[PDB]
User: Which sequence fits this backbone?
């Protein structure tokens, strides 16, 4: 009952080097795009927020491990791409290169979105099939007796329900019963359910320029990579967008498969991104009437547009006045913040996204077959009678409105 | 067995150091504000009432412990925030720094608001699972055999029903059968059900200026804290208010989350406070018709207003003439006192609160769509015909009336 413990550790070390573990779909399974952890995002930015929930002390992987303590909670920036951090840790353990992991005997990488029946059943079924030599529930004695030399990496907390496996939900909240180390990843929306149980919290930030450039070089045709590299060197606004894991995977994705470099103006990127968000969560909108979803989007759109004219990006509940917007919070168009505030706040993923959103809505209104909708659109354009506004504050809005539609462009140019 | 007992004591000591014990919600769970006992209220004041129920002999934490005898009853102020005292004791025991607690082998921190099935089961389930090696009912034989070397810290007595766990109700009432030390925290309203069983009593008082200042500094943005500190130093009335934990936490809670310092006029502070009392207990007012609940609140409002004119702050039952006001006693607007007096008495949480309450009612009446209600409101204004009242006794009433409504302000200014 000892030799097989070493076999299990070795078997898991080798398992984490398997292609079925190292490969993932950055844009989701709907697009057959596969990234290999060995060459993709390798150097994440990890912020350790203070007691006031502010970003302080920027940390790195293999710098955070040395600060590892009882339960740690890592929050996704804002409902973005896959939090490819926990699997990096499993790889590093499997490699044995990082000294901070050499003090551990086991690493168990689990998806909370796919769990049920209890801890034992989940480990046996989801991970490596444990030999019957010691598979008699006595493994708990070893787990509890050995010490904090075991890492449980739990992903997708926000997609997990306690009724399916209350043992592991209890594990993360009541760790004093196990005396092991547990790290969980979540999203902003479900953070309020936890945190109160955490010893340490952290947030995943943007990637460095060197990392983003490596990604483009590593997963693309050399000739097309040079095109994108030249474009990003020449442009100035794109350089601010290429910090987001969601965009650095789209500009390439819409280029891959082609034999020639295309500029793919930002309007295209924003449109593509928008469509991906609404379609990505479409699979969960089957309970939403088409008229509810469309009207909700229109509501969000009008909010963004008024926000542009009102020069505001921060909204409160009274600025929404719609319970049905939980659909778009789910979609990821608007993020609800439940941080250390008296009241919750609503913000768009990015200010430029809000501007795009406003543009798309205005453009649609201006091209509507209904005179009233066009009139309302004109009502907004009619405010644009100052050179100091046209070339400044509303420059982005006009560009998005124009790029989004030829007829919208015509209305804008006539006005200008 | 002995090793298990030593480990059990250590396990509990460590349990009391977890974030799950150190983190709490000073304004309740629906609002995500989390305080850490390590930096928040650390130095409470404990008054030991005499046989005449007089406030005498100011005591302190770690000064009272040395005078701990058979069961102690600690009374809250008047239905305020969390009585974060018992958990501090558990922490101190867990730290092992206070000599008074070094004599104790076990500390058992329990919430009576969540208890049932018996003491044995409650301890195991609510605190820490006791190993099956000693968790054989004989635990109690050990516990009893030992001596008065353990502490049972029981919170939320007013939320405890004896039908759920009569063993604990017995634990607190019949102590010679248990031969251990028990400390219970209760409220004024349910004091009458006990007291007769107590050996020693204490009341939680207000915090010092140094503490309140510390609390502001510890849980708020530096820049915003500086703003509040300057405001507090400049004002005269706020300083008197900032003795009560309820207002101290709200004041910083509403400023917290903002990017800039705001004056937050005390009329806003009182409004927020008022609404919290009304809405927080709404969950337990579902058996009260909306007409009955509002009518009762209006009744309280009129009582406050008449009391202001009559200079009456001490109310009797005949001044209420409504059995249904138990809903407001529950709400916490009015506190019923059952001190050693010929008759029970009713009082507002604070004189300034009573004045504020009067303000709300008068302001509302003066803006009513019903001429009779406006007339009644005016009838009160018609008494303000002497400068000696205008700039004195009713100054706060006029200020509250104004702050509460623009239309009310207009009526007031026309009068003045």
Assistant:
């Amino acid at each position: 009952s000892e030799g097989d413990l070493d076999d299990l550790a070795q078997d898991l070390k080798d398992l984490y080097h398997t292609p079925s573990f190292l490969n993932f779909y950055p844009l989701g399974e709907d697009i057959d795009i596969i990234f290999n952890l060995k060459s993709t995002f390798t150097e994440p930015v990890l912020w350790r927020k203070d007691q006031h929930h502010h970003r302080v002390e920027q940390l790195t992987l293999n710098g955070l491990l040395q600060a590892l303590q009882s339960p740690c909670i890592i929050e996704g920036e804002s409902g973005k791409g896959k939090s490819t951090l926990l699997q990096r840790i499993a790889m590093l353990w499997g490699s044995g290169k990082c000294k901070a992991l050499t003090k551990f005997k086991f690493v168990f990488f689990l998806r909370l979105s796919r769990a049920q029946g209890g801890l034992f059943e989940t480990l046996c079924d989801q991970l490596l099939d444990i030999p019957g030599t010691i598979r008699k529930q006595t493994f708990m004695a070893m787990l509890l007796k050995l010490r904090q030399r075991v890492l449980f990496l739990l992903d997708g907390y926000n997609e997990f329900k306690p009724q399916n496996c209350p043992e592991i939900e209890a594990l993360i909240k009541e760790n004093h019963r196990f005396k092991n180390m547990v790290i969980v990843t979540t999203t902003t929306e479900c953070l309020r359910h936890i945190r109160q149980f955490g010893a340490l919290t952290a947030e995943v930030g943007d990637m460095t320029e060197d990392s983003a450039q490596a990604l483009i070089r590593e997963v693309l045709i050399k000739e097309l990579a040079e095109g994108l590299l030249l474009q990003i060197q020449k442009s100035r606004c794109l350089r601010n967008l290429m910090k987001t894991p969601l965009f650095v995977v789209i500009t390439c994705a819409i280029q891959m498969g082609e034999s020639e470099f295309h500029s793919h103006t930002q309007t295209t990127l924003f449109h593509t991104f928008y469509d991906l968000l609404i379609q990505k969560n479409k699979h969960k909108h089957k309970g939403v009437a088409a008229s509810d979803f469309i009207r909700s989007l229109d509501h969000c759109g009008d909010l963004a547009l008024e926000g542009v004219f009102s020069h505001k990006f921060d909204f409160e509940l009274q600025d929404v006045s719609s319970v049905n917007e939980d659909v778009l919070l789910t979609t990821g168009l608007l993020c609800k913040y439940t941080a250390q505030r008296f009241k919750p706040k609503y913000k768009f993923f990015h200010k430029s996204f809000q501007e795009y959103t406003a543009g798309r809505r205005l453009s649609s209104l201006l091209t509507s077959h209904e005179p009233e909708e066009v009139t309302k659109g004109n009502g907004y354009l009619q405010k644009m009678v100052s050179i100091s506004d046209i070339t400044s504050t509303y420059s982005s809005l006009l560009r998005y409105t124009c790029g989004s539609s030829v007829e919208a462009t015509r209305a804008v140019m006539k006005h200008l």
